[PDB]
Amino acid sequence: SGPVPSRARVYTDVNTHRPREYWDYESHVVEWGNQDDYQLVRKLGRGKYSEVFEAINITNNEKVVVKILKPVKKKKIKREIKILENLRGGPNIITLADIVKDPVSRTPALVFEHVNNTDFKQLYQTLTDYDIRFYMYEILKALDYCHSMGIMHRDVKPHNVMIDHEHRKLRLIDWGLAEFYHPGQEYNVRVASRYFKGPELLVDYQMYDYSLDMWSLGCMLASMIFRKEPFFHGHDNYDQLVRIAKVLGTEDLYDYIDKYNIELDPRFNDILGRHSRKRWERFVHSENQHLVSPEALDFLDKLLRYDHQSRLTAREAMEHPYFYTVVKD
Ligand SMILES: COc1ccc(/N=C/c2c(O)ccc3c2oc2cc(Cl)c(O)c(Cl)c23)cc1
């Protein structure tokens, strides 16, 4: 009775071999800077958990980004800080430069390196086939790094990938939903943005792992090579799974939930239907064919699999022939 357990197939026990303080973020003691070192310039955005500003370090005229955390969840605050410090210096991980106490909100304000980002809505319309492969490889470097450090991002999406296209620089940002992977642990399924939620989240399977990020990455790849953003455009979390099933088919979906002894929410009875798997060539047309190759479709197919245990890992993905044409380092 109940779901079948699952474990990551890589980096499974990295945290249990760590000192407790590495992953015990509740015990972390924050070292504070001087908030008056930074002057806010303009607000860049606001979400449920933070407000983000362009700012200047007034001690050396340096551009920085300041993320003022909202006082909603406090252990979520220590979690993000500890993860950012643990991952600092890793390939294409945003660098946390300082932590100050904002005088107005009385909450932590995170100071990050600045990236000359262009909005993905404008940038993805300009990317060549080579650019897509290049930036995909850069994202994979960041994902393999954090996974190898025992951390899943859980909010991979174009909005959380800052790209300075003039300088071909990429940073993975917003670690507010990131979590330490502990084998056998049941996690909250209310993570990631709707269009990038893995099937495991949508069927309410809690014992997921780093492979969630690889589904989200596959969703990004599909939107880039097919020029369709987002690729799976659900109107809610239930319709999101139906949209996936209209592409991947319902037979493999039922095989997936049967393998883990998962029972679908009965509200899917009236909306899921019966769908064959579609060949990826259905989504190729004159406006995206220059972005599609046999290698791209083979890669995408190995990311967008219902069974989280069957997806390519970040390291395996970097070995894929899709990246043979990319000059590295
Ligand atoms: C011209 O319009 C723009 C130019 C740059 C621009 N840069 C945002 C930016 C950054 O350069 C580094 C880190 C973050 C940024 O936004 C974030 C949000 C969250 Cl939530 C977060 O955790 C992090 Cl680390 C960052 C945003 C708009």
Author numbering: 2 to 330
Sentences from the paper on this structure:
Human CK2 is an ubiquitous protein kinase, which catalyzes the phosphorylation of serine/threonine residues within a consensus sequence which is present in a remarkable number of human proteins. In order to elucidate the binding mode of 4b, 4a and 5 to CK2 each of the compounds was co-crystallized with hsCK2α1–335, a fully active C-terminal deletion mutant of homo sapiens CK2α.
For this purpose two derivatives of 4b were synthesized: compounds 4a (7,9-dichloro-1,2-dihydro-8-hydroxy-4-[(4-methoxyphenylamino)methylene]dibenzo[b,d]furan-3(2H)-one) and 5 ((E)-1,3-dichloro-6-[(4-methoxyphenylimino)methyl]dibenzo[b,d]furan-2,7-diol), both containing the second chloro substituent at a different position than 4b. In addition 4b and 4a contained a flexible connection between the dibenzofuran scaffold and the methoxyphenyl moiety, in contrast to 5, in order to evaluate the impact of planarity of the four ring system on inhibition of CK2. By this method, the IC50 value of 4a was determined to be 7 nM and the IC50 value for 5 was determined to be 5 nM. The Ki app values obtained thereby were 0.41 nM +/− 0.02 for 4a and 0.46 nM +/− 0.09 for 5. A further note deserves the fact that Val116 is in one of its two H-bonds the hydrogen donor, but in the other one the hydrogen acceptor: this is only possible if a hydroxy rather than an oxo group is the H-bond partner at the inhibitor side. This condition is directly matched for 4b and for 5 where the OH-group at position 8 (4b) or at position 3 (5) is the common H-bond anchor for Val116. Intuitively one would expect that a relocation of 4b’s Cl6-atom to position 9 as it is in 4a and in 5 would bring the chlorine atom into the proximity of the hinge residue Glu114 and should therefore generate a Cl-O halogen bond with the peptide oxygen of Glu114. Surprisingly, however, neither 4a nor 5 forms such a halogen bond to the hinge backbone; rather, in their complexes with hsCK2α1–335 the entire dibenzofuran scaffold is rotated compared to 4b, namely by 180 degrees around the pseudo-twofold symmetry axis running in-plane through the furan ring (ring B in Figure 1) followed by a 38 degree rotation perpendicular to this axis. However, with respect to halogen bonds 4a and 5 differ significantly from 4b since they fit so perfectly to the structural environment provided by the enzyme that a strong novel π-halogen bond is established which reduces their affinity to the subnanomolar range.
